[PDB]
Amino acid sequence: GSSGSSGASPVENKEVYQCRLCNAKLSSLLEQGSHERLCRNAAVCPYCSLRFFSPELKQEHESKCEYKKLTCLECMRTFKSSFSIWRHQVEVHNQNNMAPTSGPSSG
Ligand SMILES: [Zn+2]
Ligand SMILES: [Zn+2]
Ligand SMILES: [Zn+2]
């Protein structure tokens, strides 16, 4: 004669609503439609107009961003190239900042 006991661990896994932006499992069909609203405008670089999942991800990018330099902080006005904006900052703001190396490149 004798006796004893035992145990075990649960587990959940089934149809889940993941985000088509960061692939994050939601809590419901509603969290998906909404999570997409914030996960779309969470982090938008005012330079290249990007869209990240978190606000930090952008903060870092802005530092290594290329459009940044092409962004007239003065009047927060971005441009297509440096030569183009330069004229806007040299003719209007008249800054005449340090222009880049000239080249035969196409314009
Ligand atoms: Zn997302
Ligand atoms: Zn950017
Ligand atoms: Zn300007």
Curated annotation (Swiss-Prot):
Tissues expressed in: Ubiquitous in fetal and adult tissues.
Annotated crosslink Glycyl lysine isopeptide (Lys-Gly) (interchain with G-Cter in SUMO2) location: 58, 80
Phosphoserine sites (modified residues): 9
UniProt-annotated location(s): Nucleus
ZnF segments: C2H2-type: 43-65, 70-93
Domain of life: Eukaryota
Free-text function comment from the UniProt entry: Acts as a transcription repressor.
Quaternary data: Homodimer. Interacts with ZBTB14.
Protein name: Zinc finger and BTB domain-containing protein 21
Organism, as annotated: Homo sapiens (Human)
Lineage of origin: Eukaryota, Metazoa, Chordata, Craniata, Vertebrata
Parent-record interval covered: 713 to 806 of 1066
